[PDB]
Each structure stands twice: as structure tokens, then as C-alpha cells.
Amino acid sequence: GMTEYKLVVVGAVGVGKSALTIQLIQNHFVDEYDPTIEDCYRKQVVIDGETCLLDILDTAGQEEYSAMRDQYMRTGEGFLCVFAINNTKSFEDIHHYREQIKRVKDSEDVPMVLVGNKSDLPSRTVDTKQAQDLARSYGIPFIETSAKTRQGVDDAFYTLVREIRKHKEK
Numbered sequence: 269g270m271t272e273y274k275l276v277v278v279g280a281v282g283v284g285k286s287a288l289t290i291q292l293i294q295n296h297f298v299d300e301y302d303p304t305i306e307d308c309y310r311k312q313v314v315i316d317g318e319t320c321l322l323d324i325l326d327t328a329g330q331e332e333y334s335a336m337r338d339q340y341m342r343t344g345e346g347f348l349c350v351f352a353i354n355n356t357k358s359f360e361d362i363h364h365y366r367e368q369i370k371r372v373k374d375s376e377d378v379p380m381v382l383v384g385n386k387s388d389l390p391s392r393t394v395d396t397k398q399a400q401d402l403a404r405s406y407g408i409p410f411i412e413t414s415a416k417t418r419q420g421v422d423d424a425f426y427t428l429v430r431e432i433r434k435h436k437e438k
């Protein structure tokens with residue numbers, strides 16, 4: 269089979285995890301997608317000339333059993349840590365997600381990309397400089413996206429694949 273990357277999209281409810289994922293997969297923007305639905309998507313793409321399969325888990329937070337969260341964190345190779353630029357709490361929540369993924373994988377070397385979504389809105393509580401500072405402290409890229417306009421969306425996902433590649437070649 270073609271090379272396969274397992275990606276997991278995490279972050280506070282309402283930040284745009286579903287909208288980002290559906291924009292990547294189906295190239296349209298979804299105004300309303302039930303906040304409580306968690307689903308694994310598949311999409312064949314070409315990244316740096318490489319035909320590959322993306323398995324993307326669009327997460328929805330708490331699970332029936334915490335075992336289920338741990339399972340997808342161990343399976344996942346890379347994580348999109350998403351906040352919304354007009355939501356400070358969602359930015360603060362990033363610390364929790366960073367910690368929890370490292371904790372479950374018991375690793376200090378977990379491919380991640382920090383994503384500030386909703387960049388199309390003038391309304392902004394988290395400046396680029398603040399987000400850049402956090403990503404720098406993690407040693408990971410920061411990308412601003414808009415699931416609505418599509419800006420930055422392929423970059424967010426493809427960068428995460430490239431981060432996974434760097435980990436795997438070690």
C-alpha cells in the first residue's frame with residue numbers, strides 16, 4: 269500500500285477541527301457540524317511528489333472510556349493542536365493537549381503543529397507573536413488558518429506530515 273500517515277486533530281470544542289478536516293477532505297466549508305461527532309477520515313493526496321494516504325481523526329473531546337482517548341493518542345503519529353484566534357481559553361487549553369499527548373505516548377519527541385484557526389475574522393484575542401512564542405517553546409511550527417477561505421489548510425496538514433517524516437527518518 270501507499271505510504272500512510274496517521275494524523276489526529278485536537279483542541280477545544282468550537283475551534284474549527286471539523287471545519288478544517290472537511291475542508292482538507294471535501295474542499296468545502298461546513299457552517300454547522302455537530303460538535304459531539306468524532307470520526308476518522310481517509311484521503312489520498314500528493315505531498316512533495318509523494319502519493320500518500322492521510323488517516324485523519326477529527327476528535328470531539330471526552331470519550332465513553334478514557335481508554336479510547338489513550339488508544340488514538342498512541343496510534344496517532346502527528347497531532348494538529350488547534351486553537352481559534354478569537355478564543356483565549358482555546359489557546360490556554362493547548363497546554364493541556366500538548367501535555368496529555370506526550371504523557372500517553374510517553375515521549376518527548378511527538379510530531380505536532382500549532383494551528384491558529386479563524387484567521388478570516390478581524391476579531392482576534394491571540395496575537396501571532398504570542399502563538400509563535402508558544403510554538404517556539406515546543407519546537408514546532410505555527411500556522412494560521414481559515415477553514416472558511418481555505419487559507420493555510422493544506423499547509424497545516426502537509427507540514428504535520430513533514431514533521432512526521434522527520435521523526436521517522438531518525
Ligand SMILES: Nc1nc2c(ncn2[C@@H]2O[C@H](COP(=O)(O)OP(=O)(O)O)[C@@H](O)[C@H]2O)c(=O)[nH]1
Nearest residue numbers: 281282283284285286287298299386414415416
Ligand atoms: N469564520 C470562521 N469560522 C469558522 C472557521 N472554522 C470553523 N468555523 C466555525 O466555527 C464553528 C465551530 O467549528 P467546528 O469545525 O464545528 O469546531 P470543532 O468543535 O473544533 O469541530 C462553526 O460554526 C464553524 O462554522 C474559520 O476558519 N473561520
Ligand SMILES: *Sc1ccc(F)c(F)c1
Nearest residue numbers: 274308323324325343344
Ligand atoms: S483516522 C485515525 C484514527 C485513529 C488515529 F489514531 C489516527 F491517527 C487517525
Ligand SMILES: [Mg+2]
Nearest residue numbers: 285286302303
Ligand atoms: Mg467538531
